[PDB]
């Protein structure tokens, strides 16, 4: 018998009997996973004879208890009470919880499958000794991290101190660190207490190995998602720093892959080309891996692009694998339906180094003035663990990367409220900003800093904006003058020269 | 009995019994083909005894027209019926063994598709392989891959081994195959062509053969309706002047199949007084190329499907209008693949690239770039442009001359015209210059004119501009201004020899 | 290099690469088969690459030569010449033989696939040096023994002394002994020189075992196809012998399964009168349980309503358990029946074939001396006791003690000189014969049993024809006379005279 608190949700192995590789047993797999990491096991039998079930469950409860790890059962309360199981997982369509508690009495763990906040509200009106832990939605097809956050947030607004959480659904090594990393409460106070793997240990031809790996990921604490410094900088980006940024991107000739609409095609390639870096407009899936392999490569991503979700995923992934930077420019957040849909879908394909939007798009992303834009920019930066840029009269830049830190349970008291957020203004006077930011981040070396790079880009852009607006006779020339000003501005790093004032927020 | 040297590989008819049209026999077809051209017949085969009755029955027909009979791949049926030769494949009986059984005096054909196999064919010396069928050119590897073989047949000095091209050969591509399947030293081309479905499956085999003969023993591939004469005299100011006048007066329609270069390229075209179309629509492709002084500019990394690129490349060759090929990237796997695929869809009037793309295309400094530009020009029988600080232009068209087994009298990669002038806008430019050329024009001068005009508007723009942004709009301007006054004596770029 | 005469056709393993069990090679199988019997190997390469073929052929010719067994190749003369193969097998639709010989020159074996006599005529007009051995037709679906005999017979009429024979096609342990046994020339002078197995060694999960089995069968010489004595008896069946036969069938109460048309009721009465229980089951599943019952017996009519697939099922079921089948072909009556009979005669081994003038001449493949000649021909052909009914009944024993051998084949015992007796003084006779043979014990004798039946029947015939007033009573009196006749074994009493033929 374990007490609620002895429950280690770290690596929660949910078994699916009907997908074991030939020549291997459920005992074989679940054993390997034990003496290598698994710290909680759930048995499912939604496909067998409720008596054979019971023989496998007893046989596996001996194995588990032997490694001092609890056994949980889905979703046959009876099989659970019967074989003296340590806990039971039920879903939303399974037996009401009060009803379950009444049968099993306290002392036994009740897992619930929650996917929406509304369900956390209910879980809370029931107080403690009802739900002891929830599995959060189905993260991925088998709603994403964004939707998980919304739940962890209700678990906090409701003060459900008693209820642990595990993430579940399509969790693999290609996304476990990102899930751990951005699945944190908006007040930083709570993250995922563990991870549920299914097809990754069970279906493994070498379960001992697959488990060692998932352990390595779960008890690490650094998600180095981009090969650039993620150190938190509170000192305003200095002239000398900006100067070094531009030198690097000029010297490094970054390749910036543009996935964007027909309109920013030509324009964006000119902005990139002006910053002394080669642009590629490939929306071709096969190329995507070879492309991101090239040194100092960089992905700039527009929504309202003509390329298929399957390929955007293909690419977003391709760049995260090689630890190169993605800049995300969602040009259509409601826009409210098809684009809203596509964006949310993209934000769960990978980790972005920078998200860029204006008033509407940034308020939308934060899930809704001037102090308000500042609040929203920090919310977005934190939410998607990224540098977020909000363009307007003032541009606001917030660093929500928190040095790439993640942990189980979650952020070292670092909430939405207190991440670095700076402002950049140049008086009264956009997807060019994306291409700019892309080139600045692109040039950064191992020892660089992502946050400064982004600010540099917003300065450089805002600066070339003042200059162009002066030297021009209308919309047409304003554009060609902007490209010019970017060219001239970077050929002479004299940032002390530049018009835009960089304050704190 | 024929001796190896009496073998005329000109029009080698490989029969496939299982695709004869109703009411027609194998005898019927193979007869028609003999009266009108076929100079060699191979029989493929059913029941190994019925085989033997058809083989004897057809060996009488062939011998009657004094043409040999070859058999695939049954060595036994061959020895048995006194056949004149046997063709075996790579996966068929090892050649030394075959020779051991049939003894000398009989022809052995081998199916080669890669150089590595020519290396082996050579370690065996003469008397082993007497001729090879080169790969499968087309789906049923292309000319490029056939060249790689003819080249090994030369590096290996396999003087004794003849060659026939095989696989998906039809009237819509026979002249191009004959034309560009030549050794890199000009000393060897295809000794003949293998047709299968084109005579056998013909409802009128006599006619279909008369046609393939007309193509095989012709010697001019007029693939574009522009002069292809070899010019060694540097392109004169007065010539350049006439080029620009023509393209201005002719208002060429330049169809752009490209990526970014959409807007920019249409402006360069529009500035040269010619209308650009960005149609990647398959059905339009024929109607489009029918319009007078039409021209195809072709980028890789385009979004259009191979099936349609093929559709277009063909559409333009059919009407004898010029295609300009700009392979951008050649060097992701996916693009390398796509380019090689395109280069076998048709005949290009001009291939344009820079250092990387040109070395890649030549199958790998400054003398090196010159060597590579000639290699490419010759290889794909085309005017090849290599951009850089210096632009090199090489004419590898050789006046559209092809011949069997010779193949270029003696005009090798080394000694074709190559000039110097001291980016996907350059494509559109070249496209407009070639586009304006009339029947009596000259393709090579046109291309050089374009590289001049572009390099010229480049100097001017770089001066009158304040950055990347304006440089681009000034370049379009300078192209507009430069051509509205043909004063090429004015222009900055110096045109030397290479 | 082997000479034509060093060729041991005993167990000729024809390989079919495309049916080897997983985890096993062609080398693996053909090796196992060599250590335990195979004495000749043919490689087929249907469908593969004529160069990979050559690598497998060289690799297997080393294996074969290593066990001193030749290698033969089908049907690529070139691959054969090329790899120094010991022989080549070609089919009827493959390269003409003269041409083949011209290429390979003498010294190499040429196998030809013959299925009809006409092809033996051709094989002979070519003289020796040409065909060195033939594979006889396709015996079974994969024409039968009857058709193989027709070939061996042409090989004899044509004196093709030089040409050996192997049987081929659907040869398995469930029929190899029968094939060896009845595939003999009609003059006894020639049988099969060997047997070609394909799917039986190649597709075997244990090829070493499967081969040791086929060897056991091939070099045995007794086909004990029925659990009754098969000794040749030349001494006329004595009264005391007939008496013992009837006692045995009365004491043993044989179960006689009737597969017949009209003869349903009548036949069951004849059987029932002979103190043995008749069953009229035409049910396939029962067939094995039925034949398991002691002193069981199959009586078989053509023109029965049961499906060939079940007749086969049964004919086999009884041969497996070594119980007696009596075959009564009731008609050269209608193409359909001719067809069905020939089909049946290749399903198994019959202890007795019974017919009258027409049916016996037909079965022999065409007076009174003539009927005698035909009865012996049939008896020998189908290696069985053959009964020919008429005014005189002729009984011939063609079982030859169940003796078979390779290439020999019968120890000079031809159609001409097998025991044939006469009985002087109809599908009831079948049922009778069935009951007599049925009662015979291990130590019995099949031939005497059959004669006893023909006597007993012919005897009850005289009696009935006297005691009756027409067709109707003749029948009921016949059943009676059979009942009375056997309840008192007084064969010294009975009307019919048993002479020699």
Concatenated DSSP letters for C74-109?
Answer: ES-HHHHHHHT-SEEEE-TTSS-HHHHHHHH-TTSE
Nearest CB among B79, B91, B98 relative to C103 is that of B79
Nearest CB among C49, C76, C99 relative to B91 is that of C49
Structure's resolution in angstroms:
3.1
Please give the Cα distance from C396 to C377 (Å, whole number): 9
CB A181 within 8 A of CB A383: no
Pairing state of beta strands C40-44 and C71-74?
parallel
Pairing state of beta strands A194-197 and A255-259?
unpaired
Whether A244 and A213 map to the same domain: the answer is no
Total domains in chain A come to 2
Whether C92 and C7 map to the same domain: the answer is yes
Please give the Cα distance from C65 to B64 (Å, whole number): 47
Please give the Cα distance from A78 to C46 (Å, whole number): 62
β-pair partners for B360: none
Whether C272 and C389 map to the same domain: the answer is yes
Please give the Cα distance from C169 to C296 (Å, whole number): 31
CB B267 within 8 A of CB B473: no
Look at residues B337, B333, B255, B335 and name the one whose alpha carbon lies nearest to residue B298.
Answer: B255
Please give the Cα distance from C50 to A149 (Å, whole number): 66
CB A422 within 8 A of CB A503: yes
H/E run at residue C113: strand C109-114
CB B146 within 8 A of CB B134: yes
Look at residues B137, B142, B139, B109 and name the one whose alpha carbon lies nearest to residue B40.
Answer: B109
Q: Which B residues in the span 96-155 are in contact with C, Cβ-Cβ below 8 Å?
A: 97-98, 100-101
Please give the Cα distance from C501 to C499 (Å, whole number): 7
Give the other-Cβ count within 10 Å of C393's Cβ: 26
Å between C100 CA and nearest CA of chain B: 8
Whether A402 and A349 map to the same domain: the answer is yes
Contacts of A492 in chain B (CB under 8 A): none
Structure tokens at C495: 């009307």
Å between B93 CA and nearest CA of chain C: 4
Contacts of B467 in chain A (CB under 8 A): 274, 483-488
Strand residue runs (E) in B360-417? 383-387, 391-395
Please give the Cα distance from B52 to B171 (Å, whole number): 32
Please give the Cα distance from C74 to B37 (Å, whole number): 38
B332 touches chain A (CB under 8 A): yes
Contacts of B93 in chain C (CB under 8 A): 50-51, 54, 78-79, 82
B260 touches chain A (CB under 8 A): yes
Whether C6 and C121 map to the same domain: the answer is yes
Please give the Cα distance from A214 to A200 (Å, whole number): 9
Å between B329 CA and nearest CA of chain A: 10
Please give the Cα distance from B316 to B210 (Å, whole number): 25
Among C166, C196, C219, where does a domain finish?
A: C219
Helices and strands (H, E) in chain C, number of each type: 18, 17
Give the other-Cβ count within 10 Å of B335's Cβ: 20
Contacts of A262 in chain B (CB under 8 A): 262
Cross-chain Cβ contact C82/B100 below 8 Å:
yes
Look at residues B213, B206, B103, B121 and name the one whose alpha carbon lies nearest to residue B159.
Answer: B121
Residue B93, domain extent: 1-217
B473 touches chain A (CB under 8 A): yes
Please give the Cα distance from B37 to B60 (Å, whole number): 17
Cross-chain Cβ contact C82/B101 below 8 Å:
yes
Whether C225 and C144 map to the same domain: the answer is no
Whether A195 and A301 map to the same domain: the answer is no
CB B479 within 8 A of CB B460: no
- How many interface pairs between B and C have CB atoms less than 8 angstroms apart? 62
Whether A153 and A238 map to the same domain: the answer is no
Among C179, C197, C219, where does a domain finish?
A: C219
Cross-chain Cβ contact B260/A281 below 8 Å:
yes
Å between C179 CA and nearest CA of chain B: 30
Whether A270 and A406 map to the same domain: the answer is yes
β-pair partners for A14: A42
Please give the Cα distance from C292 to A317 (Å, whole number): 72
Per-residue HEC secondary structure of C116-145 comes to CCHHHHHHHHCCCCCCCEEEECCCCCCCHH
Set A163, A431, A439, A472: catalytic member? A431
CB A198 within 8 A of CB A372: no
CB B36 within 8 A of CB B210: yes
DSSP string, A384-429: TTSEEEEESSEEEEEE--GGGB------SS--GGGS-EEEEE----
Nearest CB among C52, C93, C103 relative to B80 is that of C103
Whether B184 and B258 map to the same domain: the answer is no
Å between A172 CA and nearest CA of chain B: 28
- Among all residues of chain A, which has the CA nearest to that of B301? A282
| C-alpha of A199 from chain center | 21
Look at residues C19, C70, C83 and name the one whose alpha carbon lies nearest to residue C42.
Answer: C70
Please give the Cα distance from B199 to B210 (Å, whole number): 10
Backbone angles phi, psi at C467, to 5 degrees: -80, 10
**Residues A475-483: contacts with CB within 8 Å, 24+ apart?**
A479/A267, A479/B469, A480/B469, A480/B470, A480/B472, A480/B473, A481/B466, A481/B469, A481/B470, A482/A271, A482/A432, A482/B469, A483/A270, A483/A271, A483/A274, A483/B467, A483/B468, A483/B469, A483/B470, A483/B472
For residues C193-226, one letter each, b for 16 or more C-beta atoms within 10 angstroms of the residue's C-beta and e for the rest, the string is bbbbbbebbbebeebbebbebbbebbeeeebebb
Q: B285: helix, coil or strand?
A: helix
Q: Which C residues in the span 44-63 are in contact with B, Cβ-Cβ below 8 Å?
A: 49-52, 54
Pairing state of beta strands C420-424 and C392-397?
antiparallel
Give the other-Cβ count within 10 Å of A429's Cβ: 11
Q: C33: helix, coil or strand?
A: helix
**Interface probe, candidates C95, C104, C110, chain B, greatest B C-beta count within 10 A:** C95
Set C64, C352, C427, C435: catalytic member? C427
B and A touch with 3+ CB pairs <8 Å, answer yes
Structure tokens at B169: 């050969």
Contacts of C75 in chain B (CB under 8 A): 48
Q: Is C94 annotated as a binding residue?
A: yes
A291 touches chain B (CB under 8 A): yes
H/E run at residue B208: helix B205-216
Please give the Cα distance from B129 to B87 (Å, whole number): 10
Please give the Cα distance from C258 to C280 (Å, whole number): 5
Cα angle for residues A378, A380, A384 (degrees, 5° grid): 125
Nearest CB among C78, C79, C94 relative to B49 is that of C94
A-contacting chains (≥3 CB pairs under 8 Å): B
Backbone angles phi, psi at A49, to 5 degrees: -85, 120
Backbone angles phi, psi at B43, to 5 degrees: -105, 135
Å between B80 CA and nearest CA of chain C: 6
CB A346 within 8 A of CB A299: no
| C-alpha of B37 from chain center | 24
Please give the Cα distance from A463 to A482 (Å, whole number): 9
In this structure, what DSSP letter does residue A107 have?
A: T
Kindly list the catalytic residues of B: 424
Contacts of B263 in chain A (CB under 8 A): 265-266
B301 touches chain A (CB under 8 A): yes
Domain at A447, CATH number: 3.40.1190.20
Among C193, C219, C245, where does a domain finish?
A: C219
C75 touches chain B (CB under 8 A): yes
Structure tokens at A258: 């543009």
Whether A207 and A251 map to the same domain: the answer is no
Domain at C76, CATH number: 3.20.20.70
Nearest CB among B75, B91, B94 relative to C78 is that of B75
Whether A324 and A412 map to the same domain: the answer is yes
β-pair partners for A405: A222
- Among all residues of chain B, which has the CA nearest to that of A280? B260
β-pair partners for B277: B255
CB A143 within 8 A of CB A115: yes
B-contacting chains (≥3 CB pairs under 8 Å): A, C
Look at residues A142, A135, A95, A96 and name the one whose alpha carbon lies nearest to residue A116.
Answer: A135
Strand order in the sheet with B323-326: B276-277, B253-257, B294-299, B323-326, B350-354, B383-387, B391-395, B418-421, B495-497
Cross-chain Cβ contact B469/A479 below 8 Å:
yes
CB A405 within 8 A of CB A412: yes
β-pair partners for B163: B132
B74 touches chain C (CB under 8 A): yes
- Residue numbers belonging to the annotated binding site of B: 46, 48, 73, 92, 326-327, 357
In this structure, what DSSP letter does residue B413 have?
A: G
C78 touches chain B (CB under 8 A): yes
Contacts of B73 in chain C (CB under 8 A): 50
- Among all residues of chain B, which has the CA nearest to that of C55? B93
Å between B60 CA and nearest CA of chain C: 18
CB A467 within 8 A of CB A481: yes
Cross-chain Cβ contact C49/B92 below 8 Å:
yes
């Amino acid at each position: 018998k374990f007490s609620k608190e002895q429950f280690d949700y770290s690596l929660y192995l949910v078994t699916d009997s009907g997908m074991i590789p030939e020549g291997k047993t459920l005992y074989g797999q679940v054993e390997a996973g034990l003496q290598n990491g698994v710290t909680l096991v759930q048995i499912r039998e939604k496909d067998a004879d409720t008596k054979f079930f019971i023989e496998e469950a007893l046989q596996i409860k001996e194995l588990c208890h032997a490694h001092n790890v609890p056994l949980i059962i889905n979703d046959r309360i009876d099989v659970a009470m019967a074989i003296g199981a340590d806990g039971i997982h039920v879903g939303q369509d399974d037996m009401p919880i009060p009803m379950i508690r009444k049968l099993v009495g306290p002392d036994m763990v009740i897992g619930w499958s929650v996917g929406f906040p509304e369900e956390v509200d209910e879980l809370s009106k029931m107080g403690p000794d009802m739900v002891d832990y929830i599995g959060v939605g189905t993260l991925f097809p088998t709603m994403g991290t964004a939707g998980a956050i919304r739940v962890l947030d209700a678990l906090e607004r409701n003060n459900a101190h008693w209820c642990r959480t595990v993430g579940i659904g399509g969790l693999h090594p290609d996304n476990i660190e990102r899930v751990l990393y951005q699945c944190v409460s908006s007040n930083g106070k709570r993250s995922l207490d563990g991870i549920c793997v299914v097809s990754d240990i069970i279906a493994s031809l070498d379960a001992a190995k697959s488990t060692k790996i998932l352990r390595g990921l779960i008890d690490k604490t650094d998600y180095k998602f981009v090969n650039i410094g993620l150190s938190t900088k509170n000192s305003l980006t200095t002239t000398d720093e900006i100067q070094s940024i531009i030198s690097n991107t000029l010297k490094a000739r970054p390749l910036v892959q543009h996935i964007t609409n027909k309109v920013h095609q030509n324009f964006g390639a000119n902005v990139t080309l002006a910053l002394g870096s080669s642009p590629i407009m490939s929306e071709i899936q096969s190329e995507v891996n070879d492309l991101a392999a090239i040194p100092h490569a960089t992905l700039l991503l527009n929504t309202g692009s003509v390329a298929p979700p399957e390929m955007l995923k293909a690419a977003i992934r391709a760049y995260n694998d090689v630890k190169r930077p993605i800049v995300f420019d969602p040009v259509g957040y409601s826009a409210t339906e098809t684009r809203l849909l596509l964006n949310n879908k993209l934000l769960t394909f990978g980790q972005f180094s920078c998200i860029k939007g204006n008033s509407s798009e940034i308020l939308g992303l934060a899930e809704l003035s001037n102090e308000l834009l500042i609040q929203a920019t920090k919310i977005v930066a934190f939410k998607y663990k990224t540098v977020a840029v909000c363009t307007g009269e003032f541009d606001f830049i917030a660093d929500g990367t928190i040095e790439g830190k993640y942990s189980l349970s979650g952020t070292n008291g670092t909430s939405v409220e207190d991440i670095p957020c700076v402002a950049v203004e140049a008086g009264p006077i956009g997807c060019s900003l994306g291409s700019t930011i892309a080139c600045m981040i692109g040039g950064q070396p191992s020892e660089g800093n992502l946050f400064h790079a982004v600010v540099a880009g917003v300065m450089l852009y805002k600066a070339a904006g003042k200059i162009a607006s002066e030297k021009c006779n209308g919309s047409g020339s304003f554009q060609v003058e902007l490209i010019d000003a970017l060219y001239r501005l970077t050929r002479e790093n004299t940032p002390v020269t530049w018009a835009p004032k960089l304050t704190h927020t």
